[PDB]
Design a protein around this nucleic acid. Structure first.
Ligand SMILES: [K+]
Ligand SMILES: [K+]
Ligand SMILES: [K+]
Ligand SMILES: [K+]
Ligand SMILES: [K+]
Ligand SMILES: [K+]
Ligand SMILES: [K+]
Ligand SMILES: [K+]
Ligand SMILES: [K+]
Ligand SMILES: [K+]
Ligand SMILES: [K+]
Ligand SMILES: [K+]
Ligand SMILES: [Mg+2]
Ligand SMILES: [Mg+2]
Length: 1330
RNA sequence: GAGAGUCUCUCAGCUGGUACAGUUUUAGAGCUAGAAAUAGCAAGUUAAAAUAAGGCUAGUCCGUUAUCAACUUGAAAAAGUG
DNA sequence: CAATACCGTGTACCAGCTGAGAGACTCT
DNA sequence: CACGGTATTG
């Protein structure tokens, strides 16, 4: 028996079908195991496996790292307490015990309830003196008196526990950067460089203007207004803007050709500045560094809002300023509300449920919600002007612990810590001896290139130790091998050379690698002149001269430079034609020029004797990121360079790795020639062979040595699937598809199919907001100031396009109107009739698509000439990608050629994604295993890959319409159709095997691939007809009988029995919801620690059931404890699972059950299937809830009527009228549809209230247009859909979900265990238990 | 058809180092009039601790990804069964 | 046992490696 | 998000 398999691989479904030679789906009797009446069952060989989406590893990672975070912060606190141990025991022998048990209720505390001092008087006195921890911090920093050791510990521990970020390197002092003085020094430098045009900065209060709580451009405008005759876009204005963090363009200032866009926040700035300094000289360096100092001062003034000369604790002083202004403004507001609005005082200051001050301090209202609740109250009253100013400033009634404290560097807390230590070490010797230890506890963080400090039990760790002892912050450098660990951090992730699998790949910025790339590109260049008969290669001498003259003096080498600076200067050619390179050479010797600028010794770089050294240098600069370690490694070359050069080298860092090893490039040599690959690239006679030719040339030993260098352990199926590149969800689909195919082959008597057809489906507002913000601030536009928008709003396609286009038409140089977006047009850059791309990367917002030009191509040349500069501005602002820009500008490059259109249609039909090829390879290597007499693979099974458009057009052309919302059958159906089309297609044109089977003029191919599917049609327009029977031309075998086979497909799509199977899965992941709920009298609360009784301490609820368990046992009853037989579902929770599996009997007996029938324990994962009466089916949602378990097999006529009537997705107007006439002639179908649903709901769904409401809603809108009634009947199928119940809407009526909140009935129903395909079953009558 | 290097991007996956909030219990003596229910008023900004229960391998480590119908033999990994 | 309604930890930064989609140059 | 847990009302 011959058959083929159709597969439909999705992210939540794998559809499968089996077809015969006639495109029929077989049906078998399958054995049914179990204890029921039924010994066998009839099954069609079509169905679909359904599963929950596979999840990535990200969330797990973030939780794991948060875990390490909390562990290490606790360890810091433990280090500090161990330092304070003895002297604190001398002063108060229970302080740390009181701190530890602070969380406990006084009933469970072992010591006094007042943490700090242990008696109420002292505690109240403390809090009255220091209402916030910042008061105590400022006191301990500024005062000179001896202080209580407990208060010292509290300050230092608060600093260590919340120590602040590490985004700034080096040290930082409070008065290191004062805005006034740095602005004055910037004015000094500017007037030193520009004596003829000086600025009068007298009377300009730079402090308040730059350190104001305002946007960057607003403070810029403020300071520029204070300087008459100076504009914000002049030189000084741009310097201030760069200080304020904007993106100034110094081009117009210095009359530059290169766009000198400088933004200090960028990683490129260090280069972007130097590049600029290359054009205007080094006299301007002092200026551009004074501006950077000013920027640092402004950044600090953001955080420290107090004078740094009255205290050494500017941060704590600013927190105390927050507290004092909170107190004053709260007193004023209370008085104001007492006087003017005395009825609202209670709602404002007593009601936690409201977003007033009560909800702000005691409830759950945030600063933002509080400001929103209290702004109208302030505007409504009199005397609230300053309060409203502070509110719009986001500085009213501030707390100290807020969301925006993430700005605080750790250097600040460190300064305060160091100050306290210097104060109190005069009174405590142990603080003098352990000052640096405590400072280190604060400053030290495990380096990212070292990872978890494990000892052989972490699967994530790679760190290597210099000595075997406990790692502490004070011996890290001596116990951890920072060098070996930093090296392993990279060498455990970097590729080896595929040609030499034992050799490491070179750094991308290595000098040798760039030499290789340049020579490889340069070897295939060809040139022609007049007297020359034929185009020539460049000789070895010519290539060397072009490298020395051009590539070693210019960063980039254009074609024009090649023509004028070599062929004219050396060869005396006035005209020459070049091939093998266009506009400019892609390769270049960037590292050569970097090192030439740093060391300034060209003869050192050109000397081959230094090659090794240079490589090592670059290696280091690439392998490491810590400048101290780079310095340590380069120390062995300190004698070759000045100290200025060695510092400049330290700062020079590279990222990236190539794809070939040094041994391949310039190591292995050809036996006879004695030359390396690079030696051939430099000079290879008149052949000029490049890398591919070199390693593929049988006359050379490179190919032989590459063959010899190869090595093998083989992955398993699952391991091999896991190591593919792709979403983990699609990978889950791949593995399930393989398992389905294995079962299907086992079904067909271990006979392998003829062909297997596979189709794979295709593949955030915060990201959109970030893109638009960055693009507009880089563009310098004020559209956001004038049109504020939230991230959610950007989910509208037109508004997102409007903003990405700076509010302007993309085809016309004119502004657009937000309030008119509904009148505008979204147009595809390349037409969707060629490239089916609807992404933002191919779409464009324009006033009218007519203005694009002709609709049969790319935007016309006139539009390109008009809009090229605007498009390049959008490109540099990253508001359009380079791909979008190239497509937009293609008309100046000839536009769309006929070859491009042919390729686009081919892409529409021929699958080229790599993940699909990997699926095909897996199935192929699984099925075809034998080799013939020539030791070539015997391809018994042909694996065909199709794209969804083929079967989609098939459905839309032969009226095999699909409606996804009706049921899950469409997946299965898709599979079937694929298997059909696929097979038929390759039977009709066997030459297509090349492009459609795994394994090894433009108008003509356009026409061909556009008409490839016409052999199914009977008549074709653009109007010759076709036979009723389509056969293969050469073999004469029949492939499609247009009078019998369509009937076959219709009968297959009409079959009501389709094996839909929802994959039962144990639940995993978090134990429960994460919210810590307050204490409550409820056994649903779960203790967050072993002794934290939730009735006193609160805790969690809502745990996830890993899997239910059927228990047949006895439970005690009443006060007598009489044993009563029971049969029920106990939900084992994820957190209980290990304990329940280690010993199920003891777990159950501790849960209450006695005399447990151990062998009648049935493990029920989620989606376990139960059948009750009248074919009614339920799936296990949990231990106490059920999901719908039946599919509604709506007949095909109603499906197609719903598709056509609702205008689901056209064709000829005559065919459109015929479809409309069929819809209107079959209007009664509507009622019939309802009837079917009704008969289903009364039989399987059992939601009387919902069904009656839906029937009334349908009988209410019977005067609505047929299209809308059908569109809402589509909604109605949520009532019958398999799975969890959900709420839907019929027109404007809303039907809430009827839930199945009890699982008692399934305990007497028939449990059904299904194989992956649902063909094999085991049925268990549960009524026979108990 | 199957690929390779380079260039210009774009998306994705995987790992590590940190920070700020949030929440929970306790501590920040509420006062007065009332026997009480309650009413009037004062006050509020902070800290400690926990942040998957926990585990043994005891590390400044690990604990939410992937994988899983049923049945026999299996100790388990497996393999086999219509 | 009803319907029935409400609720669900979030944000930010820094460092790195890999594949792959798509346009272009050169090739097996 | 959905869809399972939870309390409320009855
Ligand atoms: K006690
Ligand atoms: K001015
Ligand atoms: K709050
Ligand atoms: K807080
Ligand atoms: K080029
Ligand atoms: K590096
Ligand atoms: K030196
Ligand atoms: K899972
Ligand atoms: K390539
Ligand atoms: K209290
Ligand atoms: K599992
Ligand atoms: K199953
Ligand atoms: Mg812990
Ligand atoms: Mg906190």
């Amino acid at each position: 028996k011959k058959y083929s398999i159709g597969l439909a691989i999705g992210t939540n479904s794998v559809g499968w079908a089996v077809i015969t030679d006639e495109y029929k789906v077989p049906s078998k009797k399958f054995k049914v195991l179990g204890n029921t009446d039924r010994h066998s069952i009839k099954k069609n060989l079509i169905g679909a496996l359904l599963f929950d989406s596979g999840e990535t590893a990200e969330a797990t990672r973030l939780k794991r790292t948060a875990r390490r975070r909390y562990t290490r912060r606790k360890n810091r606190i433990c280090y500090l307490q161990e330092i304070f141990s003895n002297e604190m025991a001398k002063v108060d022998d229970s302080f740390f015990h009181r701190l530890e048990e602070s969380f406990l209720v006084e009933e469970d505390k072992k010591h006094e309830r007042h943490p700090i001092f242990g008696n109420i008087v002292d505690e109240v006195a403390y809090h009255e003196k220091y209402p916030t921890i910042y008061h105590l911090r400022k006191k301990l920093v500024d005062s000179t008196d001896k202080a209580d050791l407990r208060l010292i510990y509290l300050a230092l521990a608060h600093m260590i526990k919340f120590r602040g970020h590490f985004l700034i390197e080096g040290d930082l002092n409070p008065d290191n950067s004062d805005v006034d003085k740095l602005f004055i020094q910037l004015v000094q430098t500017y007037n030193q460089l520009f004596e003829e045009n000086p600025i009068n900065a007298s009377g300009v209060d730079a402090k308040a203007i730059l350190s104001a709580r305002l946007s960057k451009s607003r403070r810029l405008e403020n300071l520029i207004a204070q300087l008459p005759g100076e504009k914000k876009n002049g030189l000084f204005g741009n310097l201030i803007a760069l200080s304020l963090g904007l993106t100034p363009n110094f081009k117009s200032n210095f009359d530059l050709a290169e766009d000198a866009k400088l933004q200090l926040s960028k990683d490129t700035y260090d280069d972007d500045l130097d590049n600029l300094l290359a054009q205007i000289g080094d006299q301007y360096a002092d200026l551009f560094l004074a501006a950077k100092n000013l920027s640092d001062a402004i950044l600090l003034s953001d955080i420290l809002r107090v004078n740094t000369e009255i205290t050494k604790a500017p941060l704590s002083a600013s927190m105390i300023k927050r507290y004092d202004e909170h107190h004053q403004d709260l007193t004023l507001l209370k008085a104001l509300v007492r006087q003017q609005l005395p009825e609202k005082y209670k709602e404002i200051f007593f009601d936690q449920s409201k977003n007033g001050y009560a909800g702000y301090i005691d409830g759950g209202a945030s600063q933002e919600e509080f400001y929103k609740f209290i702004k109208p109250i302030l505007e409504k009253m009199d005397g609230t002007e300053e309060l409203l100013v502070k509110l719009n400033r986001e500085d009213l009634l501030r707390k100290q612990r807020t969301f925006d404290n993430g700005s605080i560097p750790h250097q600040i807390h460190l300064g305060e810590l160091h100050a306290i230590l210097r104060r109190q070490e005069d009174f405590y010797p142990f603080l003098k001896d352990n000052r640096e230890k405590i400072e280190k506890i604060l400053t030290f963080r495990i380096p990212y290139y070292v990872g978890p400090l494990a000892r052989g039990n972490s699967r994530f760790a790679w760190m290597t130790r210099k000595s075997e002892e406990t790692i502490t912050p004070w011996n890290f450098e001596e116990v951890v091998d920072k060098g070996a660990s930093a090296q392993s951090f990279i060498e455990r992730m970097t590729n080896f050379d595929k040609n030499l699998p034992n050799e490491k790949v070179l750094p991308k910025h290595s000098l040798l690698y760039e030499y290789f790339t340049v020579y490889n590109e340069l070897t295939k260049v060809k040139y022609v002149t007049e007297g020359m008969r034929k185009p020539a290669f460049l000789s070895g001498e010519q290539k060397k001269a072009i490298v020395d003259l051009l590539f070693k003096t210019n960063r980039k080498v254009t074609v024009k430079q090649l023509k004028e600076d070599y062929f004219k200067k050396i060869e005396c050619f006035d005209s020459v034609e070049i091939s093998g390179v266009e506009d400019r050479f892609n390769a270049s010797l960037g590292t050569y020029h970097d090192l030439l600028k740093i060391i300034k010794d060209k003869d050192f770089l050109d000397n081959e004797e230094n090659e090794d050294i240079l490589e090592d240098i670059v290696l280091t600069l690439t392998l490491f990121e810590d400048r101290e370690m780079i310095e340590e490694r380069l120390k062995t070359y300190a004698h070759l360079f000045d100290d200025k050069v060695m510092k400049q080298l330290k700062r020079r860092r590279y990222t990236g790795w190539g794809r070939l090893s040094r041994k391949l490039i310039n190591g292995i040599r050809d036996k006879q020639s004695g030359k390396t690959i690079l030696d051939f690239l430099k000079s290879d006679g008149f052949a000029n062979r490049n890398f591919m030719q070199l390693i593929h040339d049988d006359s050379l030993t490179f190919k032989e040595d590459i063959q010899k260098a190869q090595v093998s352990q083989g992955d398993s199926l699952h391991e091999h699937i896991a190591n593919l590149a792709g979403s983990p969800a699609i990978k889950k689909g791949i593995l399930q598809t393989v398992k389905v195919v294995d079962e299907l082959v086992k079904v067909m008597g271990r006979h392998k199919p003829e062909n297997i057809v596979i189709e794979m489906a295709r593949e955030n507002s915060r990201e959109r907001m970030k893109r638009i913000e960055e693009g507009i601030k880089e563009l310098g536009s004020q559209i956001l100031k004038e049109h504020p928008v939230e991230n959610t709003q950007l989910q509208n396609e037109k508004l997102y396009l409007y903003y990405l286009q700076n509010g302007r038409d993309m085809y016309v140089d004119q502004e657009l109107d937000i309030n008119r977006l509904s009148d505008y047009d979204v147009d595809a850059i390349v037409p969707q009739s060629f490239l089916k791309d609807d992404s933002i990367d191919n779409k464009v917002l324009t006033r009218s698509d007519k203005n694009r030009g002709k609709s049969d191509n790319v935007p016309s040349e006139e539009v390109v000439k008009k809009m090229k500069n605007y498009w390049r501005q959008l490109l540099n602002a990253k508001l359009i990608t380079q791909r979008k820009f190239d497509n937009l500008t293609k008309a100046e490059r000839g536009g769309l050629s006929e070859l491009d259109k042919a390729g686009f249609i081919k892409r529409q039909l021929v699958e080229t994604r790599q993940i699909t090829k990997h699926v095909a390879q897996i199935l192929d290597s699984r099925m075809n295993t034998k080799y013939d007499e020539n030791d070539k693979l015997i391809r018994e099974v042909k694996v065909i890959t199709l794209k969804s458009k083929l079967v989609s057009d098939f459905r839309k052309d032969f009226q095999f319409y699909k409606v996804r919302e009706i049921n899950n059958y469409h997946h299965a159906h898709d599979a079937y159709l694929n298997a059909v089309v696929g097979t038929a297609l390759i039977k009709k044109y066997p030459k297509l095997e090349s492009e459609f089977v795994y394994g090894d003029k433009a108008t003509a191919k356009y026409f061909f691939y556009s008409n490839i599917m016409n052999f199914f049609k009977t008549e074709i327009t653009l109007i010759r007809k076709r036979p009723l029977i389509e056969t293969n031309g050469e073999t004469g075998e029949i492939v499609w009988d247009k009078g019998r086979d369509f009937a076959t497909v219709r009968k297959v799509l009409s079959m009501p029995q389709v094996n839909i199977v929802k994959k039962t899965e144990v639940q995993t992941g978090g134990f429960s919801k994460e919210s810590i709920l307050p204490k409550r009298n409820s056994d649903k609360l779960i203790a967050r620690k072993k002794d934290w009784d939730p009735k006193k301490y609160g805790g969690f609820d809502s745990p996830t059931v890993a899997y239910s368990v059927l228990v047949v046992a006895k439970v005690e009853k009443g006060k007598s404890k009489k044993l009563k037989s029971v049969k029920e579902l106990l939900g084992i929770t994820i957190m209980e699972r290990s304990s329940f599996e280690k010993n199920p009997i003891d777990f159950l007996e501790a849960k209450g059950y006695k005399e447990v029938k151990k062998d009648l324990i049935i493990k029920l994962p989620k989606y376990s299937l139960f059948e009750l009466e009248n074919g009614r089916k339920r799936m296990l949602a949990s231990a106490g809830e059920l999901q719908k378990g039946n599919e509604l097999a709506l007949p095909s006529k109603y499906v197609n009527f719903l598709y056509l009537a609702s205008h689901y997705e056209k064709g000829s107007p005559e065919d459109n009228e015929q479809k409309q006439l069929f819809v209107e002639q079959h209007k009664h179908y509507l009622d019939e549809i309802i009837e079917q649903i009704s008969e289903f709901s009364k039989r399987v769904i059992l939601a009387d209230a919902n069904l009656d409401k839906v029937l009334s809603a349908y009988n209410k809108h019977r005067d609505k247009p047929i299209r809308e009634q059908a569109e809402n009947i589509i909604h109605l199928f949520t009532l019958t859909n398999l799975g969890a119940p959900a709420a839907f809407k019929y027109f404007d009526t809303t039907i809430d979900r009827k839930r199945y909140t009890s699982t008692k009935e399934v305990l007497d129903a028939t449990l059904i265990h299904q194989s992956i395909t649902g063909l094999y079953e085991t049925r268990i009558d549960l009524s026979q238990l108990g």
